Design a protein around this ligand. Sequence first.
Ligand code: NI
Ligand code: NI
Ligand code: NI
Ligand code: NI
Lengths: 445, 445
Amino acid sequence: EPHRFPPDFQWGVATSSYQIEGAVEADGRSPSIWDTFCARPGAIADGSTGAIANDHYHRYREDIAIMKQLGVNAYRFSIAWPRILPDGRGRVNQAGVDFYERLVDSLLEQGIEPYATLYHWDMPQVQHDRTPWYDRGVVDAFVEYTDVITRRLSDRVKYWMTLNEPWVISFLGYGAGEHAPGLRDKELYLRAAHHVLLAHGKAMPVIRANGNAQTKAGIVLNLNWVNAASDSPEDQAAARRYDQFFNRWFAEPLYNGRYPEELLEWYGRDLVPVQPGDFDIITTPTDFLAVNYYARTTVKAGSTDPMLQVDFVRPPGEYTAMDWEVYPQGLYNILNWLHTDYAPPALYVTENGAAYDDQVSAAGEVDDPQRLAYLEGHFEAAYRAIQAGIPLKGYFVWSLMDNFEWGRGFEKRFGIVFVDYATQQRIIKRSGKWFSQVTRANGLP
Amino acid sequence: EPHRFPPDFQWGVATSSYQIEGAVEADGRSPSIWDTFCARPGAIADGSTGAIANDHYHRYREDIAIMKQLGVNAYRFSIAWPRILPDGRGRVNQAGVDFYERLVDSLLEQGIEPYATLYHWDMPQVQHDRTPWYDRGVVDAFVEYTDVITRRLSDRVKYWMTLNEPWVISFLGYGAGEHAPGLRDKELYLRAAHHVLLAHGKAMPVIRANGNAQTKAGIVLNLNWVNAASDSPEDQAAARRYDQFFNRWFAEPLYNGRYPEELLEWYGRDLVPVQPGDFDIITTPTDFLAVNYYARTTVKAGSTDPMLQVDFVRPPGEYTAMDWEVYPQGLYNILNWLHTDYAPPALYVTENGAAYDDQVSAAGEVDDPQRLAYLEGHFEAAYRAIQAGIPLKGYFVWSLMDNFEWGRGFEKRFGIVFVDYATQQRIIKRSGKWFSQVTRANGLP
Ligand code: NI
Ligand code: NI
Ligand code: NI
Ligand code: NI
């Protein structure tokens, strides 16, 4: 049954720098906000840090060989600002730039297209000391960083992502206190959210300028399918607020030059530090929109989250180890919504995947049928989306291998490749072996 | 017959270092956590900082002369750890030590007894980067600082206070995000609360050892009178939780070696990082208990404060510009409770005062009848406490002069002396002139 994807479809896997690289003091790297945050009691559920991680800084070539086994034609990673500009600004760290040159050279040598994320949450601590995301001066700082690295890599890297998951950077970082730098303030989150958008917009012309005609760039948004727990007006309203908060807070500014009004009013409109011309910057044209999709979230009115006055409900269904509902149809729905409402020239699924408890068998294999079924359903939903004329150009599985899952530490494994953290051994999981077939087939089954 | 106080009663005024000193970069001083926190948008209501304050670092002699006008025989101030040990630990900054030597010498020369607070919220930023209050290593850091300064000043300073308002340092700093360092987490607040108590206990033997037979030391607790909004069980329980949170959380450990059990259970007892021997340390005997009293707080069951599940009610009555209820009877009730329940050998009111909108009249005077009436009622309540056999030894008005009121900035004026921040001119207010008679009469006119 030829459920084949388009002939140039990009099949990849995704990682982020602090999640896999380790080697946190190597070669002039300065501490990121995450290096500092992991020190805080209760911040990381298993008490771990990203100090070693997958040790990908040293093991990249081996990982690239794994990718060859996987059959991917694309690889999404992030570049660590602390390696490039350890003082946050000013002097370029040659050694740091050199790592990414070696990585990109190795990828292209193996026929793997590099998709580079500029910012995936690891701002140098020294830069955050000067300009936290709630401080407008952060925009120029991120742009300087973008300029340095893009000038060095634009000859080899064609696809760039500006910032990964604005909602996470702003809300979790500054609103819920769950991610670095670990603050919890509604105003700080809204300021951070606005400045992330501004940084994305100011960065785009820089990327295009340091590139060539082939250069493509966009932002990466986390989106999930949102449902109301019931038909009650309070629940419909709760769902609508959460949807505006999670899914529309960035998309509407990016495409329509406005924040969702009802949520804006509810917050207090003056808390967003919009200045004249900001929306013109924010709406700067992009080549694509990248989407990170994981789950359906079902909402009712309540007090669990005091800021939005909502509670979360779990419909009967299948759940991952992250307590996230498995809802493959949600991916189709999100792609369709973006395509009908904003009409981006191209879409990419830059992240999709699942965490389940994995064990290594006596045979030395990792049998993960739940994760495989998860991936299968979502790939199917993406295939349906393409058949419906949605311009989905690629799909990147989160993640290549198990890694530091932020506040959950190393306890939640998202990889299609298992990592034994005692020895750094990599074992391709059953889902990974299956994926090796999908990529070569292009794709299902 | 006159309501005369005891013949040796200490009448004073109080300040803190960051609130009055200014000169934040002078003579080797490093940034405190408050210098950093003032940079945060929304942190300070009027957008101000403590960079200049009352410029007391330069103007201390002038201020001391004002104290003489006021007739005080005692002065409560705090010492800045950032001046003494700018690197947080290690090298003593002799210029910093020198300011406090000159301050104390000048005070004793005028017959004013110094009452010195070791920690009034200004940890050096560099030290906080190593040991925040939630990190147990903070205890030895504070003890080192205590040791250095007590050796230099113990020959002239007899009365020492270890830490000012544990509840503020831990809850406002780490639990509500309102004070530096601006974090909002239940676990972090409880760890901080416990470590402040431990710092107090470890500090006491150091202060005693560096001193002589005259040396007296204690902690300073903020306490307010708490009332339930009604007789409903939900309201009583809410009031109980708040009382335990605000008034008993520190006092019960200090005197009985335990935290209030019901609130402890409510929080989750594992969050307090109690280790063996800690309570033996926390209960180390003190010479006195210092009390900071301002208001009556009325509580009902509610979801406004989600951590305690309480709401606040304003009974019909008189309110200051801080929106705090004026209830002088509360002061007597608090003193009586401490005296009956814990029997401290001595008590001091280390802070009591009020903020009202002040204006300078055309005649160049500040007529503040509401602040005057506030002070009169509370002084009367203190007089009643002494007649009841409570061993109240002194009363310090907050504050000598208008100053940086933390999160409210300079907009809230607590002084009995007005400060025109445009010129640094000091105008003794009417309440201050009135107080000048109380001290000299040693009781209420
Ligand atoms: Ni079919
Ligand atoms: Ni009488
Ligand atoms: Ni000077
Ligand atoms: Ni511990």
